[PDB]
Amino acid sequence: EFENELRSMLATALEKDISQEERNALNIAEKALDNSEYLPKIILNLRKALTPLAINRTLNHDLSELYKFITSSKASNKNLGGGLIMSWGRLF
Amino acid sequence: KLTFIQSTAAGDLYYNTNTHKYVYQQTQNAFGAAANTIVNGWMGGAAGGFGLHH
Amino acid sequence: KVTLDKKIRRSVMWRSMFLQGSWNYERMQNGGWAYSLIPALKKLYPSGEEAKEALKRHLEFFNTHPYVAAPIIGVTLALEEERANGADIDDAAIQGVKVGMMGPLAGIGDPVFWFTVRPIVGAIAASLATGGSIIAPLFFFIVWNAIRIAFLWYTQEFGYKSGSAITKDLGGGLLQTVTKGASILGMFVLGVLIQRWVTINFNGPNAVVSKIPLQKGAYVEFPKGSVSGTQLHDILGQVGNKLSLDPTKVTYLQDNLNQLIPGLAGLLITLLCMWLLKKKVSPIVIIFGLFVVGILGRWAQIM
Amino acid sequence: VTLDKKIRRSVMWRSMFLQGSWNYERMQNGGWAYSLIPALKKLYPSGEEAKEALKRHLEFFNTHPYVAAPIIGVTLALEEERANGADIDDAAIQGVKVGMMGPLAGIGDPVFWFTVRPIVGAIAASLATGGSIIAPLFFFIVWNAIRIAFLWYTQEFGYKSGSAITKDLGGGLLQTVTKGASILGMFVLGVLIQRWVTINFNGPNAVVSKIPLQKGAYVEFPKGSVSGTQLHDILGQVGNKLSLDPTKVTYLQDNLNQLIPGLAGLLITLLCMWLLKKKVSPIVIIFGLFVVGILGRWAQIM
Amino acid sequence: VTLDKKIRRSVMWRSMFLQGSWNYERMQNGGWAYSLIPALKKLYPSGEEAKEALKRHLEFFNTHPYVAAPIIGVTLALEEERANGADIDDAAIQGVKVGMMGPLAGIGDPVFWFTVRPIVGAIAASLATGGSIIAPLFFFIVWNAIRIAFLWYTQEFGYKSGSAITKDLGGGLLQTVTKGASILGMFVLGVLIQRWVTINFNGPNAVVSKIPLQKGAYVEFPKGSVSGTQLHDILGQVGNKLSLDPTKVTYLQDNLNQLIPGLAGLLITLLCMWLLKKKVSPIVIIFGLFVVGILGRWAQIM
Amino acid sequence: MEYGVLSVILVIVVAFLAGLEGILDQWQFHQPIIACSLIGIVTGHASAGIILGGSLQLIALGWANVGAAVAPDAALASIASSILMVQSNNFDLTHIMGTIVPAAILLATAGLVLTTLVRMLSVVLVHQADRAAENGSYSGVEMWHFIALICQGLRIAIPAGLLLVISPDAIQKALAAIPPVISGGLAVGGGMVVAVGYAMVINLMATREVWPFFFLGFALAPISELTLIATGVLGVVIAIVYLNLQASG
Amino acid sequence: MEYGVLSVILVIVVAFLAGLEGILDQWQFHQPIIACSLIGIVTGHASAGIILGGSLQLIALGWANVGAAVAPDAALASIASSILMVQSNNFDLTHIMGTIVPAAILLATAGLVLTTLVRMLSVVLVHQADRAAENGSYSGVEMWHFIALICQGLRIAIPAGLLLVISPDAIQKALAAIPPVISGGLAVGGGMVVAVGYAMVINLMATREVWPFFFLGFALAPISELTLIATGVLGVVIAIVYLNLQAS
Amino acid sequence: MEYGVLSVILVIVVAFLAGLEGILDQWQFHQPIIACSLIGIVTGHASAGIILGGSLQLIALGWANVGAAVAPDAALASIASSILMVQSNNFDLTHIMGTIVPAAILLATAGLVLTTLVRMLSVVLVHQADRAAENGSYSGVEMWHFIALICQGLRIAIPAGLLLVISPDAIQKALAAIPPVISGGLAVGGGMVVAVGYAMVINLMATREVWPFFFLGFALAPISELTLIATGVLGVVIAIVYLNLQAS
Ligand SMILES: OC[C@H]1O[C@H](O)[C@@H](O)[C@@H](O)[C@@H]1O
Ligand SMILES: OC[C@H]1O[C@H](O)[C@@H](O)[C@@H](O)[C@@H]1O
C-alpha cells in the first residue's frame, strides 16, 4: 500500500516534465525501488536531493505532490534509532 | 552478590541477593558524571548522523 | 503591508515555549508549531479559506530540538509575510525550508543543549547543593532560563532578518563534503559503540561448555591452618604468572566467543536486526521480542 | 539434455575429486575427466564421439585446485552448445583452456594457497594454544564451507556467462583482486611474525642486570599468620604496581621487547628470506634452524 | 688544488669542532675558520690573500651545528673556483652564507634538538628502567650514526651542488620528501606530547571525590585471621572486579584521564605555541614553567 | 507536612508544574534540583528537599529524550521520591541512598512507561485538533494543544495525590515485591534493544564505500586504553584524511 | 582400562582414518587439533586431547611437504603423542608441554623416515598399474590405487596397535631415556621453524608498494586485545580503503 | 672508597669530556643518559648510574640552546647529580626522584650561569685570534680555537674535582636544607618544560593538511604496548601510504 503507490507516483512524475538536476535522483530512486532495498533509505535519498531544489524557488510543479507525500507523516524519520543510541544507549 | 538492574550518569542500581532490596551504588563524581554525559551524548550524536542522515 | 512588527514577533517567541505538549508518535511537534505560529497567521489572514489551508500547512511533521527552532520559526515568518503580501510562493518552499534545517539543526542541538549545557549547569547546581542552600535551584533556574531565552530571541531575530541569506547557503555546496564526513565518522563510531555499549555476557550459572578437572600442581593449592608468609608468597606468585583458581576449571560460552573476537554477540544481534528490518518488520516487535528473550535468558540462567 | 540443475549439483559435488592422479607428463588430468563424465554421458553415451571427447579432455590440465568451477562451467557450456548447436572442434577449447589456465592459476595461488589458507590455519591454531576443543570443528566449519560458498557460486556464474567473459579475464579486475590479497596477506603475515615466531631470549644466562630492590620497592611478606590489614596492605601494593622479591632480573628479551616486540622473529624471517632467495632448499634451512635452537638451549640462552 | 677528497674528510673531522669559541658579539666564528683551515692551507698559504682569507672567514656566522655541511660544501666550491678560475669578490661567499644562514638554522634547530634528540633519549631511558647496560650504548650508537651520516652526505651534496643547485633546490622530489617528513614528524610529535608531558594532578589535596562503597561492592578483609578458603575467596573477589577499602578517592587526574589521557599536556603545548608565536624567548617560558610547577607544589595540588 | 491544606495544594501545584515541564523541557521544573527543592520549600524542611534534589541531579544527567526515544522521566522520580521523604520523617542522608534513591530510579522507569502511554494518547487529541483546523477555528487548535498539555500535567499530578494518601511503607513493599528475575531480564533485554537502533541507523546510512570504516571501528574498540573521546578523534581524523585524499585525487 | 572395551577397537579405526588423511591431507584429521581430539573423545578424557591438540597445533604450523620433499607428517606424531598421553595418566599441562609435545617432534622425525620407506613401496604398485593399464581393465587401476592407499594408511594403524599392546614401562623408560637438552633444543627449533614458511609466502607476494602494509601489521600486532580475527578484519578493511582510494 | 684509585682520574676525564661536549653537542657525552652512565660505571655501582641517567634524561629533554638563549646545560647537572649519588650511597629509587633530580635541576641552572660567564670570557680569546689572523699564521686560529675549547671544557672538570675534596657532611646538610616544596616543584617543572621544544617544532611544521596526523598520533599514544619505535614505524608507514595514494 506504500511501495506500489510510490512507484505509481514516480512513474507519473518522471514522464510529464523533469529537469536534469532531479532526473538523476528520480532515476536512482526508481532503480533502488525496483531492486529490493530498504524503503527508508530510498525515502531519505529522494527527500535530501530535493531540498536545495525546493527551498530556492524551483521544485518543478510536476513533482510537488511527490515532495508532499515524501514529507508526510509516514515517510518521515522520527529518529528512532539515533534516539535509542542517545537516550537508552548508556542506560543499561 | 549484586545483580545489575540499571545504569545512570552517576552510579548503577543493583539488587542485593543476601538482602531482598534494590540498592543503589554511586560510582561517578559530579565532575565525572558531567564529563561522561558530555562524551556519551556527543558520541551518540556522532554514532548516527549529525542530522544529515535523518 | 504588515511587516510583522516587533510586538507580534515577541509574542511569537513567548508562545514558541509551548512547542512540545501536543507530542505525537504520528506527527511530532505539530500542535506546538501551529500554536506558536497562531499570532502571525491570524495577523496575516484570519477567518478565511487560506487560514484553513495555512493551518493544515503548519500542522505537518516537525521533529527538531525545541531550543533551536527559533531560527526555523523566524525564517518561516519571513517567508510567510512575503508569501501573503509579495511573492507567489506555493505550498512547497515552506515545507522544504522546514525540512532542510529541521534535521541538521536537531542533530546539532541535541548534543549541545541536552548533553553539553544541561549536564554542566546541573553538575554545577548539584555541586553546591550538598549543604541545603537555596542558591542551588536558584542558580540552575536563572542560568538555564537566561541562556535559553537569550538564545530563543537572538536566533529568532537573526533568522527573521536574514531570511534568504541562509536559504542561499543551504542551496549551495560544501554540504556534500560535510555529509560524507559525517557518514564516515558515523560508521566508525557506530562500530565502536556496537562493540562497547552492547554487552550480551553469556556467563550464567549453567550453560558451561567446558568443566574439565585439573590436577595436582596445575592450580593454586591452599592451606587450612595458616596461610603464613612464605606459602602466601608462593600463592601470590602462582596467581601472578597465570595459575588458575580451584581445580574445577570452568569455561563459559562467553569465554569462547571472546577468544574468537570480543563483542561478537552484539554484532550478530545487530546484523540480525538489520536483516529483520530489511524484511519489513516493525522495530517495536523486535524490541518486545528482545525484551522477552532477555527475560527468558535470565530465567533460563544462560545469561 | 540442457544440463538439469540436479546434474549440475552432482557435478559440483564430484568435482571435489579433481586432484589425486598427480603425474609428470599430464599433471592432474584424471580428475577433470571424472568431473566432466556426467555431461559427456548425458549428451552422447557410448559412441566414438564420446571417445574423442575423452581424448580431448586428457591433455595438460594443471590449475589451482580450488579455482576450477569456472573451468568446469565454461567447458560444460561449450559442450552443451557444440553437441546440439555449433560445430566447435577440439581446438578452440584447448586454446581457451591453455590461455586461461596460466593466469587463473596465478591468481588462484596467491588468494587461496598463501592468502586465506595460512590465515585460516593461524586463527584456528592461535585460539588452540590453550588446548581449545572448538578449534578442529571450527576449522571444519570455516574451511569446508568455503568450497560450498565459492566452488558452487563461481560454477553457476561461469555456467551462466558461458565463454563470453573468459577472454576478458585479466582486463582489470584480477589485478585489483591480486593487489588486495597481497595487501591483506602482507598485513596478516607481519602480524603472524610478531605473534607466532618465538625467539624468547630469557635463558638461565643472558641476564643484562641483577639490581637488588630496596625496602618499600617490593612486597614485604611477614613471618607467618597473615591477617587483617596485613593481607590488605600486601594485596594493595601487589595490585598497584609493586613486584615480588627484591631481586630485579632482566634478560635480553626484555630489552628487545622494549625496543620492538618480536624484533628477533622479524630478523630471523628476513635472514631466511635472504637465504631462500639464494635457491637454498627449505629442508636444510629447517635443519639449520633446529641445530641453532639445539645449541642455543645447550648454551642456556634460548 | 682540485680539493682532493681526503682534504674534505679532514675538513669534516675538524668541523666536528664547529663550536667552542662561541661568542655573543661575533657568534660561532672561530670554529668556522678552524674548520675551513685545511682548504686555505692547500689553496693559498703564506700570502696577503691568505691573511685576507683568514680575516674574511672569521666574521659573524650563526647556524645549527649539524645543518652547516651544505654551507661548508658551497663555501669550499666557491673558494676553490675563485682561487682557480673566476675572480669572485668578497660579496657572493658572504651572500651565499647569509642567504641560507637563516632558513637552515630555522629548519635544523627544531628538527635536531626537539624532534630526534627527544625520541632517541626517551627510547634509551625507557629501556634503562632496569639498569640495562645497553641503554647508553644504544643512544651513542644511533645518535652518532645519524649525525655522521647526515653530515657527510650533506657536505658531499653541497660540494657537488655548488652555488646553482643549492638555490634551485625544491623541484618535484624535495616537496614530496618535505611533506612525508612533516607527516611523520606531526605523528611522532603528537605521540611525544601525549606520552612525555606529565601534569600529574594527584596532590594530597585536590581529592575531587571521596564517596564511600557499600557491602557487597568491595572486598571484606577478616581482621582476626584469613587462613583457609577465606584467602581463596578474597583472591577470587579481587580478580573478578571487586575493589579495595570502601573509600573511593577520585583525584582530578583521574577525571582528566577519564576524559582523555594527556590533556593538560596538550593544552600547555598549545599555550606554549601561542607564546612562541608572540615572540617570547624559549628560556623565559622554561623559567615560567619551572615557577608554575613550584607554585603547584606549594598549593599541594600537583 | 508542616502546614495545613495549603501544603496539600502546593505539592499538587508543584507536581503539576513538573508534569508540564516534563514535555515542555524548557524551564526545567521537572529536573530534580528544581522539583525536589520546590516540594521541600512548601512542606517544612527545605534542606532535605534540596539535598535530595542535588543527589538525584547527578542521576538525572543523561536523562534527555532524543528523537521519539523517551528518557527515564526524572519528573516522576523527583516528585515521588521527595514525597516519600516527606512521609517518612527522617532525613539523615543515609536513608536517602538507602531507600529513596533506588525508589526514585524505579519510579523513574514507571514514569517513563506512563509518559509513553500518554504520548500515545495525545495522538487522538492532535487528530481532533487537525479536524477542527479545517473548520478554520484557531481557538480549537489552541484549546486541544492546551488539553494535551493539561493531560500530561495531570499524568504526574494524580500520582502525587495518590502517593500522598497511600501509607509510606506500601510503596517500598510493592517496589521490593517484584521478583529480581523480572528486573534482571528487563536489564539484559534493554542492553540488547539498543542494537535495534544501531541497525536502523546503519540501514539509513549504509553505503558500500563506508562499511570498511564500520568494521575498522568495530575491530579497534576492544582496546581499553582508548577512551570514547580518543576513538572519536580517530574517527574524525580518518574522515578528514580520507576526504583530503579523495579531493586531491 | 579406559572408557570402554570398544574404545581400543575404535582407536584402531580412528588411527587408520588419520593415516589415510595424512597422505590425503584434505580433511585435516592428521592435524593435532583433530587427531588428538578424536582419539581423546573415545579414550576416556575427551578434553585431554583438545588441550594436547591445541598445544601441538601451534608447533605443527608450517609442516607441509613442498616439491618432492618429506614433511614431518604429523599424522603419526599427533597420534603417538595422544596415545602416549592417555597411556600415562598425567595431564598436568606441564607434562604435555615437557615430555609429550617435545616427544611429538621426535615422533614426527621418525614418521618422516617411516613414510619415506612406505612411499618407496608404492613405486612397484604404480609400476604394475602401468603394466596392467594396457590390459584393458578399467577396474584394475582403481583397485591398485586403493591397494596403495591402504598400504600407505596402515603405516599409522600398525604402530597404534603396537603401542596399545606394548607395556607402559617400556614406553615410559624410552621417554625417560631422551636427553632433555636435546628435547628443549628442538622445542626451540620448532618454535623457530615457522619463519621458513613465512619467508616463503612473503617471497611469493612482495612489492615495493605492499611492504608498508607488512610493517604496519607487524607494528600493530603487539596489542594483545586484538585477536587474529580482528587482525584479519583490519587487513581486509585497510586493503578495501586503499583500493577504493587508488581507483579514483 | 670506590671501584679504584684510577676511578678518580676517570671521573675528572669524563668531566672534562662533558665540558668539551657541552657546547659542541656532537657526541652527547654531556647528555645525562651518557654522562651519568659513564660516571657511575667507573665509580663503582654501574647500574645505579644507568638508572639515574634514564630518570634524569626524561626531564632533560628540550634542554638545547637556540640563538644565544643558553640551555640549562645538562653537562654540569648530570655530573654533579651522579657524583652526589656516588658520594652518599642511596639508590632507593625514591632518593633518586626525591633528592637528586631537583638537585640536578638546581645544578643545571648553576651550570647555565657558569657557561654564560665562560661564553662571555671567550670573546676576548676570539678577538685575540682575529688580531693574530693578520699576522698570516694559520696555527694562531687553531690555537685560539683550542684554547677556548679547553677553557670552556674545564668548567665541568673543576667543580667535579673540587667536589671530591669537599667533605660529605657539608653537601649532605646543604641538600637537607633545601625545602621539599622547592624540590617537588622543580621536579614538576622539569617534567613540564619539554612542551616548549614540542611547541617550537609544531610551529615550524604545521599545515591544515598535517594536523590530523598529529591528532591521530596523540590519541593512539595511551596504548602502552606500542613502544616509540612502533609509533615511528606507524608514522613512516602512514606517510608512505599517503604519498603513494596522493601521487595517483
Ligand atoms: O596451480 C598449479 C597446481 O599444480 C598442481 O596441480 C598442485 O600442486 C596444485 O596445488 C597447484 O595449484
Ligand atoms: O532531537 C529531536 C527532539 O525530538 C524530541 O521529541 C524531543 O524530546 C527532543 O528532546 C529531541 O531532541
Ligand SMILES: OC[C@H]1O[C@H](O)[C@@H](O)[C@@H](O)[C@@H]1O
Ligand atoms: O640555530 C641557532 C644556534 O645558535 C648557536 O650556534 C648554538 O646555540 C646552536 O645550538 C643553535 O642551534
